[PDB]
Write a structure and sequence with these properties.
CATH architecture of the largest domain: Orthogonal Bundle
CATH superfamily of the largest domain: Topoisomerase I, domain 2
Strand order of the largest sheet: 9-10-14-13-12-15
Shape: flat
Radius of gyration: 30 Å
CATH class of the largest domain: Mainly Alpha
Largest sheet: 6 strands, antiparallel, barrel
Bound molecules: thymidine-3',5'-diphosphate, thymidine-5'-phosphate
Oligomer: monomer
Length: 557
Amino acid sequence: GKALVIVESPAKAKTINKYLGSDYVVKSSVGHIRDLPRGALVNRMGVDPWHNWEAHYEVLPGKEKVVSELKQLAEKADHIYLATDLDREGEAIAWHLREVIGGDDARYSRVVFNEITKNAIRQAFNKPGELNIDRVNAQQARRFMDRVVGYMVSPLLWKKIARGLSAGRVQSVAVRLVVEREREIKAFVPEEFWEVDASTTTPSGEALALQVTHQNDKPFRPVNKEQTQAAVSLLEKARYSVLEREDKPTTSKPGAPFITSTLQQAASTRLGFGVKKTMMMAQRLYEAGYITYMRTDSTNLSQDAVNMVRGYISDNFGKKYLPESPNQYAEAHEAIRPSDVNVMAESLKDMEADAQKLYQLIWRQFVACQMTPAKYDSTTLTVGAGDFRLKARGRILRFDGWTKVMPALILPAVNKGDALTLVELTPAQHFTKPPARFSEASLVKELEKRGIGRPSTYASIISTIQDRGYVRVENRRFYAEKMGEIVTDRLEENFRELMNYDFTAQMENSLDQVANHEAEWKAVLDHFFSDFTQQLDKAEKDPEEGGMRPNQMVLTS
Ligand SMILES: Cc1cn([C@H]2C[C@H](OP(=O)(O)O)[C@@H](COP(=O)(O)O)O2)c(=O)[nH]c1=O
Ligand SMILES: Cc1cn([C@H]2C[C@H](O)[C@@H](COP(=O)(O)O)O2)c(=O)[nH]c1=O
Ligand SMILES: Cc1cn([C@H]2C[C@H](O)[C@@H](COP(=O)(O)O)O2)c(=O)[nH]c1=O
């Protein structure tokens, strides 16, 4: 008569089983159990846009075994707990388990937790919740419209452009961003601008480096060899002196604990990890109960989490690193942080080196976020030389603050009015450089920025656009393929709304309204499908009627 606890993976089962008494029987479904696959089109999609979005879910291959294994486990249990992940997909999976197993809805509870620890599991089963149909509807809505775009747009692409090509509701918009970035880079015309550095000696022979900033009180920006040399000869004869000294106490505050998007960026910048790699390892860490749920865009930290880390900072770093009050970064979810701050990367049980480095990265950002600011004494020397003004910036670390948890890593003395002796002038030619190429994690950042992605879809978006001749990662950077641009233009021309960034961001909002009972999923899908078929209908017409242009290059005749 024990309770049945269902999770989606063996790894998560093992971890949660350590925190559930013998009264519970943990069992992983190891997969989605059930899911989707002119009536022909409807059957292929498994969803019917014409019959009020009636769906057709069938158990995945070899899962009928898992199904028949769960039912009998349920008949021996007084209650079934669906402990799927906390996001919508997880809710949907919980729904699929409750549907497939059957029985009284009262026999089912929906436990929510953002980390698999003793206390988090206790709090989750002490106040078990109900399955939220709206989050399930929100998830299915997303899924249904992705199926519609993919299965209804792709065919048009095969007929008009080339067979084998794919279309993705959000994938096509992600690609568009890369394609626009590609075109920016292709059209960019580098511009030449000069800079002039001056080496000088303070009264007491100390070396001081300055860069000219003003000439005639106007920004010094020579654009060629002659203008620079002309400025150089004026500068070689000028008398140098410190027009003014400015000593200001500055500080650098630690960043907020990680959320999905920032974790990916930092893992990509500091560890060279790609999005797929970071998310796969994040999941590994989360499922082993080492970090909080890795799909979040909430920077909140629970009081226990904050008090725990503050205890760590206090014992391991000291009073000077402990802020008076806990840092508050601005839902109900939490940031990606380690579950136990006292567990070090080196102490993780079965995690490969890279998974340890990701944890370490998460741990440090977490601890640092709750530490005091670093203090520096910033100095700004402004030097006058004839009609020129030169600058020298520098700072010395007074207190490392939060930087103490990061790996271990000089303007001379001079008073206002002191004369500087010129030693050498160094003119340097530079050129404005084209916009940086998106990186996997950098594209996500842009996606988030535009409210296009979502914690649990960012990674899927990145991968899903990568193996379809549209865009490719070369040296950890995105490059737009010819087909990518060809398709992106076709879609921009005949599926404007679908390709529009705001509308795409708005759809994410529309999905949030469904998840929050502020909109009905079918009506939302109806509206999406309405705008969609209208776009699609004109796209299918001959180009002479405003239809999509075939990817052809007609000869002279
Ligand atoms: C997570 C992490 C941060 N940091 C420091 C480097 C950055 O400071 P500087 O910009 O002053 O170099 C800052 C970046 O934080 P984020 O990774 O959150 O962006 O935190 C490390 O040195 N190593 C790490 O592994
Ligand atoms: C799994 C999944 C989750 N989510 C999200 C967004 C929110 O963080 C959370 C849903 O929670 P909410 O119902 O309380 O809004 O999960 C998506 O937007 N798409 C998905 O596919
Ligand atoms: C080209 C290159 C990028 N990167 C990174 C850092 C960032 O995570 C990402 C690109 O982001 P950025 O445009 O903000 O620099 O890829 C490396 O770590 N090494 C490299 O050699």
